[PDB]
Amino acid sequence: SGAIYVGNYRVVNRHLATHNDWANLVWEDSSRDLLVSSTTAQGCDTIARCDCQTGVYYCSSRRKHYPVSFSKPSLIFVEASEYYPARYQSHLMLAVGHSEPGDCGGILRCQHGVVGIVSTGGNGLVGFADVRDLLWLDEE
Ligand SMILES: CS(=O)(=O)Nc1ccc(CN)cc1
Ligand SMILES: CS(=O)(=O)Nc1ccc(CN)cc1
Ligand SMILES: [Zn+2]
Structure with missing residues (x-):
């Protein structure tokens, strides 16, 4: 969460x-x-406005924050999870790290602020839904 x-x-x-x-x-x-x-x-929270590929994310299933390198947001095939079928997810960033379903919602942050939230896991990866493109989050 x-x-x-x-x-x-x-x-x-x-x-x-x-x-x-x-x-x-x-x-x-x-x-x-x-x-x-x-x-x-x-x-x-402050939203990052940047193309960082390094940051720190919170993993609830370890009660730990981990430093990670992550891919730029892309259209990625995601295997079936407890909450979605196998499908393509857009604006998704991957890192090597631990992620179970209840880890979804943990923040990924860089030096500029919040990058995204945990959204995928399994097979030793953690996937994060990017929010840095949502510039309207910063006004109105
Ligand atoms: C290919 S994707 O998964 O839609 N990710 C994406 C989409 C649009 C932009 C905007 N410059 C950047 C990244
Ligand atoms: C069958 S599955 O692989 O566990 N994936 C799945 C998980 C949750 C829903 C929503 N009820 C749909 C599909
Ligand atoms: Zn950044």
């Missing part, structure tokens, strides 16, 4: 969005596994 709180937006994995998220929907994209809903309180 986990979210990004930027401005008056809450960014969550689409597959973990709640009814309240859907009832306050801003934007969602199944191919990216992302959903954004509106919030009443302003959030503490």
